[PDB]
Coordinates of C-alpha atoms in Angstrom, one line a residue:
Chain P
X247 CA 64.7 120.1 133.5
X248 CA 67.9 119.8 135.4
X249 CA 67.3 120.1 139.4
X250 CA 69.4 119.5 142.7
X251 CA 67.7 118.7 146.5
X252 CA 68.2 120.9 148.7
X253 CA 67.3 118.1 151.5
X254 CA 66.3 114.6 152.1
X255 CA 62.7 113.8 150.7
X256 CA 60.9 112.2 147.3
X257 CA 60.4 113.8 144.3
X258 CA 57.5 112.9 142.2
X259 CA 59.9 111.3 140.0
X260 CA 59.3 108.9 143.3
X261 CA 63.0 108.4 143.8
X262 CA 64.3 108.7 147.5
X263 CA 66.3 111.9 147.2
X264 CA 69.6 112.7 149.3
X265 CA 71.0 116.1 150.2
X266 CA 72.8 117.4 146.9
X267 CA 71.4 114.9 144.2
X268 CA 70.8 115.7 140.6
X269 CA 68.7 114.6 138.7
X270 CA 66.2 115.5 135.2
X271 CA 62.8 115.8 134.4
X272 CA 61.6 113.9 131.4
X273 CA 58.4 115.8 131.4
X274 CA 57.1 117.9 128.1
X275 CA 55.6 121.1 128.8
X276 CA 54.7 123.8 131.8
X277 CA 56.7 122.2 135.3
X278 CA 56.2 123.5 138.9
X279 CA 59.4 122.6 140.5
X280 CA 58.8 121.2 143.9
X281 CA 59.6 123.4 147.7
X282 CA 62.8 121.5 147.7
X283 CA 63.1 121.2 144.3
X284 CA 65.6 124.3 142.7
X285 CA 65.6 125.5 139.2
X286 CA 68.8 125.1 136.8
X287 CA 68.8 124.9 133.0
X288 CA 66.7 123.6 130.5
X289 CA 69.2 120.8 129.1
X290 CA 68.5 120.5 125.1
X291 CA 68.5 117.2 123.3
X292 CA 71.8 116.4 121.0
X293 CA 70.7 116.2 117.3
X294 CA 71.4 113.1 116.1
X295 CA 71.8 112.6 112.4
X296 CA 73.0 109.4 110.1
X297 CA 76.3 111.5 109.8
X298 CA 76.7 112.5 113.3
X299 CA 77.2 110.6 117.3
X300 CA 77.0 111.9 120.6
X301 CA 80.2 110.6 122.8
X302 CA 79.7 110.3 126.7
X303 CA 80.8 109.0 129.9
X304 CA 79.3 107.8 133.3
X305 CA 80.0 110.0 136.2
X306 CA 79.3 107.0 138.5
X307 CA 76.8 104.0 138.6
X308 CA 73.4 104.4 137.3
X309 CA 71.6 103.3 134.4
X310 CA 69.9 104.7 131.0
X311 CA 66.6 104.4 129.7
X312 CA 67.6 101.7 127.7
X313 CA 68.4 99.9 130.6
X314 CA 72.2 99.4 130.1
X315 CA 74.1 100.1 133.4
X316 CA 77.2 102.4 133.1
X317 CA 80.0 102.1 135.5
X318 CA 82.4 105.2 136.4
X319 CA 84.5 105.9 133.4
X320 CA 82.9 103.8 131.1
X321 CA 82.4 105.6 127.8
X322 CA 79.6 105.1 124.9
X323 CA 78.5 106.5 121.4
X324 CA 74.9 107.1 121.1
X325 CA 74.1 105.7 117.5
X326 CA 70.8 107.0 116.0
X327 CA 68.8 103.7 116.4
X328 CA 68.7 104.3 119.6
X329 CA 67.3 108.0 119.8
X330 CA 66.6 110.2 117.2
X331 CA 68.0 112.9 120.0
X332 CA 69.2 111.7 123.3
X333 CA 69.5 113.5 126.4
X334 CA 72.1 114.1 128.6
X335 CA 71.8 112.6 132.3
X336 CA 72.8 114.5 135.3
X337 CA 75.7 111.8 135.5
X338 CA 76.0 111.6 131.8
X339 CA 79.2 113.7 131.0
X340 CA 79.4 114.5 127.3
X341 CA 83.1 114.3 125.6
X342 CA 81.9 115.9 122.0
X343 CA 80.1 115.0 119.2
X344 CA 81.6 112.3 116.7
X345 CA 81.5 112.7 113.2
X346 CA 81.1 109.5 111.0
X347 CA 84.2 108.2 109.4
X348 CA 83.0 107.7 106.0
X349 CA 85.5 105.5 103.2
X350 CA 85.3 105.2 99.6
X351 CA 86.2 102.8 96.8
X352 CA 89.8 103.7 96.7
X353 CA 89.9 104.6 100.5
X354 CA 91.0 102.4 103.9
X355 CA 92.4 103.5 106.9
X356 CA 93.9 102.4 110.2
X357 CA 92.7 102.3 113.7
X358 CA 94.9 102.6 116.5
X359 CA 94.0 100.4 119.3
X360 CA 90.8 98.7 118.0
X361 CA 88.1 98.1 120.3
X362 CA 88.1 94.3 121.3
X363 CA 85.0 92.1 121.8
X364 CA 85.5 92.6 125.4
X365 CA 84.5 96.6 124.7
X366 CA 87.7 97.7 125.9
X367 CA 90.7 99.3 123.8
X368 CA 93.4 96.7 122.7
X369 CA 96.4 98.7 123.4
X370 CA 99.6 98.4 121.1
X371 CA 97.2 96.9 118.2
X372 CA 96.2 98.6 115.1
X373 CA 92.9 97.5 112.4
X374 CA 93.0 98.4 108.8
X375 CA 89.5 99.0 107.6
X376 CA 88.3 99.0 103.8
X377 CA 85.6 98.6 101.5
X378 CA 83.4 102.0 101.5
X379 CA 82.6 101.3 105.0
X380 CA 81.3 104.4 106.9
X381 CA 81.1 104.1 111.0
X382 CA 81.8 106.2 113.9
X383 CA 85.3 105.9 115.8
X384 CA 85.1 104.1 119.0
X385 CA 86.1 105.8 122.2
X386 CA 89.9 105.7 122.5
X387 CA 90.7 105.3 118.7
X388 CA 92.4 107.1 116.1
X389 CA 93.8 106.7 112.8
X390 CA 97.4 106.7 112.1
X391 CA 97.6 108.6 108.9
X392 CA 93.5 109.9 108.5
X393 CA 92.2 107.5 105.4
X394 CA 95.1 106.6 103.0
X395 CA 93.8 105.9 99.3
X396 CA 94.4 102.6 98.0
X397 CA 97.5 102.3 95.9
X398 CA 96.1 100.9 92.5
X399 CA 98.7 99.8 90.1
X400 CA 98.9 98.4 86.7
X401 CA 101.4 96.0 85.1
X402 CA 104.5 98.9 84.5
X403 CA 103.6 99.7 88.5
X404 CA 105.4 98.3 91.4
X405 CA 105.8 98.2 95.4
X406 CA 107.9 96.9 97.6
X407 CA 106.9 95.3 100.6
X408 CA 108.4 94.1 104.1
X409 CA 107.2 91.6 106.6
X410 CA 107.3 93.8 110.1
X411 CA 105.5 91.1 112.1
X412 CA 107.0 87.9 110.7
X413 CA 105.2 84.4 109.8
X414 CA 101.8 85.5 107.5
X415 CA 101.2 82.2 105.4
X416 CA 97.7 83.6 104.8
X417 CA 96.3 87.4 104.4
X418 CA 99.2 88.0 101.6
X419 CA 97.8 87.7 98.3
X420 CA 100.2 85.2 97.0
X421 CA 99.3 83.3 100.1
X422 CA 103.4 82.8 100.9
X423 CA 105.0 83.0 104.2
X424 CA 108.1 85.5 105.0
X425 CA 110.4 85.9 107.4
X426 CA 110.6 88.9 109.6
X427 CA 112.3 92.1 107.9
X428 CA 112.5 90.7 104.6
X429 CA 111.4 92.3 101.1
X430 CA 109.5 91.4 98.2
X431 CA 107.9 93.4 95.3
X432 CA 103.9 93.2 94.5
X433 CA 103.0 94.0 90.4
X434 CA 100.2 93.4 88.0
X435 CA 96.8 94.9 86.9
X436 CA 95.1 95.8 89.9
X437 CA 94.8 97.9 93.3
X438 CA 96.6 97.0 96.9
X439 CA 96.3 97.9 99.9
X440 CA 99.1 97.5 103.3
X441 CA 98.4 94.7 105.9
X442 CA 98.5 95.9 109.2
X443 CA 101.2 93.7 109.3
X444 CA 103.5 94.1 106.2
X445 CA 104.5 97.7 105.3
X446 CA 105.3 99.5 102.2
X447 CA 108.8 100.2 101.1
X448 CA 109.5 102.0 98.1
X449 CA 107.1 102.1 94.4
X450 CA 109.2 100.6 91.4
X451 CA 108.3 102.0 88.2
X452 CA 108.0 101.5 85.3
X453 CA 111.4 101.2 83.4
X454 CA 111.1 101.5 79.5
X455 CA 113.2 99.4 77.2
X456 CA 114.2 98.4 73.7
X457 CA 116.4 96.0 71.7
X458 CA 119.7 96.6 72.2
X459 CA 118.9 99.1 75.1
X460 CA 119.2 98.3 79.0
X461 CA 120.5 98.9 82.4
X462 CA 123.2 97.4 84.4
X463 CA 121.9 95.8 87.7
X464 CA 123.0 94.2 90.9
X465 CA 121.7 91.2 93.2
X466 CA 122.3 92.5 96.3
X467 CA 121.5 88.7 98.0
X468 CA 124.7 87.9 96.0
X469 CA 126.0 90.7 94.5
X470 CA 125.4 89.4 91.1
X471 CA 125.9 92.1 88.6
X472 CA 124.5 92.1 85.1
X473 CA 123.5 94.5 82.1
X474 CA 119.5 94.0 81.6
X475 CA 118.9 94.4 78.1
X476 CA 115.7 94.0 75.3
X477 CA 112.4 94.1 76.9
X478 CA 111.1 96.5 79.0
X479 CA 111.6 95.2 83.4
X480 CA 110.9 96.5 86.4
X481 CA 113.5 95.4 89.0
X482 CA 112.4 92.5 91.1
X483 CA 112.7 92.4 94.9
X484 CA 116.2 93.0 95.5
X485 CA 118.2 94.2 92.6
X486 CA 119.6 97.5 92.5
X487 CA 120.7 99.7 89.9
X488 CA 124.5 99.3 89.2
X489 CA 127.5 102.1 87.7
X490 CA 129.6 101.3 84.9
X491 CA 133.1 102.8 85.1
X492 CA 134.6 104.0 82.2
Chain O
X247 CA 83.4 112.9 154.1
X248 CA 87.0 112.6 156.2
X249 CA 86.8 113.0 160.0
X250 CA 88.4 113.5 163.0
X251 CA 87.9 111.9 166.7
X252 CA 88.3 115.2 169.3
X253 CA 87.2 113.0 172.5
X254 CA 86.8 109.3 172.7
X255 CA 83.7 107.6 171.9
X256 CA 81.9 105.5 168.6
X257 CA 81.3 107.3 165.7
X258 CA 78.0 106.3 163.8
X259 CA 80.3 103.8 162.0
X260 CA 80.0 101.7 165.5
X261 CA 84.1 101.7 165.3
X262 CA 85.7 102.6 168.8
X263 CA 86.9 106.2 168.0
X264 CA 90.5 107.1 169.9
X265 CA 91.5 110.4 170.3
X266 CA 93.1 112.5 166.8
X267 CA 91.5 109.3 164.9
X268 CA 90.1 109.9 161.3
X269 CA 87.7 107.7 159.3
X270 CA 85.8 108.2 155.7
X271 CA 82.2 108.5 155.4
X272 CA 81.1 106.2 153.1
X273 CA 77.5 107.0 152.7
X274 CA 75.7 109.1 149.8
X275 CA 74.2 112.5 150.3
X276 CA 73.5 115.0 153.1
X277 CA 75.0 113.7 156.1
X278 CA 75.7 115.3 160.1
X279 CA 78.5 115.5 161.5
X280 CA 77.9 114.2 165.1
X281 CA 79.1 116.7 168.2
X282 CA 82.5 114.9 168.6
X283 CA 83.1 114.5 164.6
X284 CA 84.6 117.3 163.0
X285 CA 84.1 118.4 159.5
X286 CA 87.4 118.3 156.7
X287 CA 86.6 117.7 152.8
X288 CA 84.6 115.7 150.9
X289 CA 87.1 113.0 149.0
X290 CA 86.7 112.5 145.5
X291 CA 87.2 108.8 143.8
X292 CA 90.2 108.7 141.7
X293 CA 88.9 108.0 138.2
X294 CA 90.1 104.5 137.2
X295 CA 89.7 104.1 133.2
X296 CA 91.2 100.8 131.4
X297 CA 94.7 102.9 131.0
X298 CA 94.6 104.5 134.1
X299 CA 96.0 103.3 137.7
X300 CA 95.9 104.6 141.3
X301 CA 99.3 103.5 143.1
X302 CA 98.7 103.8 146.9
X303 CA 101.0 102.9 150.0
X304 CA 99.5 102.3 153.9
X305 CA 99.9 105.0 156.3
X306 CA 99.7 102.1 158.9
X307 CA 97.7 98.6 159.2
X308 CA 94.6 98.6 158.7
X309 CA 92.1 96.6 155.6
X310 CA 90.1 97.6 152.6
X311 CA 86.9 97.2 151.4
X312 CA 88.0 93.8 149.3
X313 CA 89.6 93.0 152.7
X314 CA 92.9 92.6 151.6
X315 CA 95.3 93.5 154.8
X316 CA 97.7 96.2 154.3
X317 CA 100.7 96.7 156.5
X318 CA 102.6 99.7 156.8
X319 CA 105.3 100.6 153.7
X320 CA 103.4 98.4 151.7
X321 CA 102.4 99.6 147.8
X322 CA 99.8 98.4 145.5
X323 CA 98.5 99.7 141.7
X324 CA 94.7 99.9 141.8
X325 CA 93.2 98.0 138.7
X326 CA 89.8 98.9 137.0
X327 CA 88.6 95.4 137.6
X328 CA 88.6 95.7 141.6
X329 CA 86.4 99.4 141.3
X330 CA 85.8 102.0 138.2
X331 CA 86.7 104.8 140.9
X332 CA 88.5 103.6 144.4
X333 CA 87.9 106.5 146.9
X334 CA 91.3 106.4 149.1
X335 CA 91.4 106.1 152.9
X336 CA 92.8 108.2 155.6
X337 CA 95.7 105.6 155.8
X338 CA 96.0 105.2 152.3
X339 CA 98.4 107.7 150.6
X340 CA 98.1 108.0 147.3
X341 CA 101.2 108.1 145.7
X342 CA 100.3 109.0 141.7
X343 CA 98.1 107.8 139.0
X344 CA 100.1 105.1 136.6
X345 CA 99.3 105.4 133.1
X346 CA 99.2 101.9 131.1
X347 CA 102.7 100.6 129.5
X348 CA 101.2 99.4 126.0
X349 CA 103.2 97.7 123.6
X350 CA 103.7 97.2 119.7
X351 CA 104.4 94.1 117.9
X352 CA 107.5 95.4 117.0
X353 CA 107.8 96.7 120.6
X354 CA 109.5 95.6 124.1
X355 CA 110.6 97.1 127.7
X356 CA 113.0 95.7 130.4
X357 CA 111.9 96.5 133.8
X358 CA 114.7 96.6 136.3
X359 CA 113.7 94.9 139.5
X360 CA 110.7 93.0 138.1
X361 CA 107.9 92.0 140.6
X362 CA 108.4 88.4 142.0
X363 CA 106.1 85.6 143.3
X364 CA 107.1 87.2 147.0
X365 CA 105.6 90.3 146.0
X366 CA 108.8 92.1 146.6
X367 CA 111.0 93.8 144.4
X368 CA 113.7 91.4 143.2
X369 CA 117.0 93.8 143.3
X370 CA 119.6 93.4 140.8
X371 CA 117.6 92.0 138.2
X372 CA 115.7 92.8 135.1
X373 CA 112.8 91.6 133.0
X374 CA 112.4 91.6 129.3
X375 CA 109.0 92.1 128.0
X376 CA 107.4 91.5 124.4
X377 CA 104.0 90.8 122.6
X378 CA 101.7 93.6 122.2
X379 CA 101.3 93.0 126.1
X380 CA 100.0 96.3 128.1
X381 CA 100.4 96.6 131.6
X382 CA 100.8 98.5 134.6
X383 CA 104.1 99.2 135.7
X384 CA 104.4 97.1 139.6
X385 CA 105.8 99.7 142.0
X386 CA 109.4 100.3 142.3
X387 CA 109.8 98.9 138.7
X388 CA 111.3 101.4 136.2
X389 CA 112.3 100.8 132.2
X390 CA 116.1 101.2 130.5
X391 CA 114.9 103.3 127.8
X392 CA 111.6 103.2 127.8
X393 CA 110.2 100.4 125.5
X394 CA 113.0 99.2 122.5
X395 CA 112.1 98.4 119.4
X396 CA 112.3 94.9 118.0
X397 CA 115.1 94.6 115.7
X398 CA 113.8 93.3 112.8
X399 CA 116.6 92.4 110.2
X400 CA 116.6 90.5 106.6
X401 CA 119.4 88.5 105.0
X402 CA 121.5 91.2 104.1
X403 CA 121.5 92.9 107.7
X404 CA 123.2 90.6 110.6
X405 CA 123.6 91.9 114.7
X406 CA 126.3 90.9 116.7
X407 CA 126.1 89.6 120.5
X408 CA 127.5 88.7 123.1
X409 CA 126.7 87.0 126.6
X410 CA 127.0 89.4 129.3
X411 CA 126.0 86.3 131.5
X412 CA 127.2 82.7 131.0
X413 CA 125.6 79.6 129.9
X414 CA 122.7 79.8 127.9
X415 CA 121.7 76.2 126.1
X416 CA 118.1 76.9 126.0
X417 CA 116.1 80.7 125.3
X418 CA 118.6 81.2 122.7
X419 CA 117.6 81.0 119.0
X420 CA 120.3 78.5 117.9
X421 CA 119.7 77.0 121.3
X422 CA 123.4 77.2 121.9
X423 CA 125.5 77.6 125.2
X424 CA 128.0 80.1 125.5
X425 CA 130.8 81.2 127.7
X426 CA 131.0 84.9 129.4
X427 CA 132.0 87.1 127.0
X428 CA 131.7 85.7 123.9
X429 CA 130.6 87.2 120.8
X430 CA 128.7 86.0 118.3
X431 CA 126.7 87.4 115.0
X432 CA 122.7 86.6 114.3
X433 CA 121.2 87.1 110.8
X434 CA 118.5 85.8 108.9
X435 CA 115.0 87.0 107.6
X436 CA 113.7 87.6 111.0
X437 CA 113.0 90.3 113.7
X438 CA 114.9 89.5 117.1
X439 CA 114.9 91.3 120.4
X440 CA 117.8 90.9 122.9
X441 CA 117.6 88.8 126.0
X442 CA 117.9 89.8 129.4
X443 CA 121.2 87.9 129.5
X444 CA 123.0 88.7 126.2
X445 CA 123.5 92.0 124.4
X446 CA 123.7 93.7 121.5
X447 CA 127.0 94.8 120.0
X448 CA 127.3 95.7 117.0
X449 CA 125.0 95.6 113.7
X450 CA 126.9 94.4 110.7
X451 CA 125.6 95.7 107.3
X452 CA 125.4 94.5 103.8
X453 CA 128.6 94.4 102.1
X454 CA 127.5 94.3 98.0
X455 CA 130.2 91.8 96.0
X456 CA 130.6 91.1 92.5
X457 CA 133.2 88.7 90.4
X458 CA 136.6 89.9 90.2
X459 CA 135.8 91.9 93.3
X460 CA 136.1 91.5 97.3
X461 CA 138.0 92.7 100.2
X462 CA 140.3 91.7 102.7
X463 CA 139.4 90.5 106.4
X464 CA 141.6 89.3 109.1
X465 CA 140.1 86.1 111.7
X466 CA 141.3 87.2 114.7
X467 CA 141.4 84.7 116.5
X468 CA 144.0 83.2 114.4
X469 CA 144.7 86.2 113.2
X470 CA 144.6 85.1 109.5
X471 CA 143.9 87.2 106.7
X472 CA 142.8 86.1 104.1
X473 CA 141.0 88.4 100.8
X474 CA 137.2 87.0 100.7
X475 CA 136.1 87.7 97.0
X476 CA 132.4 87.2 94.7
X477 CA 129.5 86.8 96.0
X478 CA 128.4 89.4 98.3
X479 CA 129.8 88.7 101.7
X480 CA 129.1 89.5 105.7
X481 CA 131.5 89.4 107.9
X482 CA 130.9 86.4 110.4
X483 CA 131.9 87.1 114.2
X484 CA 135.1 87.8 114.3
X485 CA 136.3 89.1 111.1
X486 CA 137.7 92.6 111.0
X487 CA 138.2 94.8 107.9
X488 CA 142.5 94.5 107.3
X489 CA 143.7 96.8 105.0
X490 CA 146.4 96.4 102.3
X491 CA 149.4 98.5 101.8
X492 CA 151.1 99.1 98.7

């Protein structure tokens, strides 16, 4: 039960109670609001279920009944460990309801500006996230592109990759180092997924081939041309398809 | 709650009140206006989130709450980290809220007149800035363009420059001096980002080069043609495209 005072005094909540304050009343059940007390609203919990969050904000200093103190502009999600349905304080001003961000198998996406350790928003940063994960978006986030699938590719499948943010010996699955803005292909029996630091480029594919059957071809590195012939192959990382000229 | 002094006295504040003066009212809930005081507005905070930023600029000298001394003309962001919501003062106008200047790894700004040790503007000058660094913009400070993009480039792609201002041994990548005016071309597989000193000129491309194949370039600084043939083939930093005639 929402209420306001109408001038100096206590409520039985037994806070001291300046002119204009707001505060609820926790109490189940028939309530006789005090002389100085005033009537408002009934304020109804937020259902909160495994799939859904309730976002809010402090409107200044005070503290919940969980004990964590919230400071002006500060901004939460109420998980559903904590209440099964919270309740909105007087000074507890709610931004929406936050779906849960479920993933699957095949499924990763990226967050802009993930939250740090420090609780606030790493601006100009971006997290890729995998691995059927399901969880609610912090405050300040959103994806890029809203859950890209996972490119699985077999053997006659290919993707080019570049190196935006330059020097990865690690992370890459061939565990090799690149310089910044350079390509290479990725190929074999299995799925992939972007770093948040290389990016995708274009998909090779697959390029059948016979004995005395091929395709002229170009190293662009060198410009190397030759006629590809016999087996079936993919172009590698650079070469580029080349025009004969009768 | 703002006030105003219509006859000499002490307001409750204990401050010696001079005619026309005006003060806050710092204190929570219902208050009186004494006989003398006269009532204006009450003065909201400014809300202060992590991207958010008040700028304000004294009216006159006087000092804040921190008790940092403010004399007149003087400008100052307001960061999350001194209050989650500053509530401004009669001397204190408030110029405009500053939004956060994020960055991307692949991102960077010059600010023109960056902020010195002084705490003055330093005219005439600029500031390159680069790392996934956010920040507040310092007052007076304004960006080029409004944050460049690194220019990442690969083996095949090469960027000419040239040094708008002279001698540079060190902060250059080939840690190389150069006279005024110079130019030179960079390539590699590497991102770059111009320095505050030198500039971009012009970004030479791949030039694809096979045997029996090749063009004609001029040096002219010698001015010596000469047909380069093969393997593909950028042109270094001062050789221009010459053109045959049959």
């Amino acid at each position: 039960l929402r209420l306001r005072a109408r001038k100096e005094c206590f409520d039985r909540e037994g806070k001291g109670r300046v002119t204009g304050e707001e505060w609820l009343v926790r109490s189940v059940g028939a309530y006789l609001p005090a002389v100085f007390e005033e009537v408002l609203d009934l304020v109804d919990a937020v259902i909160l279920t495994e799939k859904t969050a309730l976002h809010l904000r402090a409107l200044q200093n005070f503290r919940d009944l969980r004990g964590v103190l919230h400071r002006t502009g500060e901004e939460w999600l109420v998980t559903v460990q904590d209440t099964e349905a919270h309740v909105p304080d007087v000074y507890e001003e709610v931004l929406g309801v936050v779906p849960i961000t479920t993933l699957g198998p095949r499924h990763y996406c990226v967050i802009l500006d993930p939250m740090g350790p420090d609780g606030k928003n790493q601006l100009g940063q971006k997290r890729v996230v995998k691995g059927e994960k399901s969880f609610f978006l912090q405050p300040g986030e959103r994806l890029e592109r809203g859950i890209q699938d996972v490119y699985v590719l077999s053997e006659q499948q290919g993707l080019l990759l570049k190196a935006l943010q330059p020097l990865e010996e690690g992370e890459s699955e061939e565990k090799v180092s690149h310089q910044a803005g350079d390509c290479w292909l990725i190929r074999g029996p299995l799925e992939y997924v972007p770093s948040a630091k290389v990016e995708v480029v274009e998909e090779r594919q697959a390029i059948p081939l016979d004995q005395n059957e091929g395709i002229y071809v170009q190293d662009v590195k060198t410009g190397k041309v030759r006629a590809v012939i016999g087996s079936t192959y993919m172009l590698t990382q650079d070469e580029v398809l080349w025009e004969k000229e009768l």
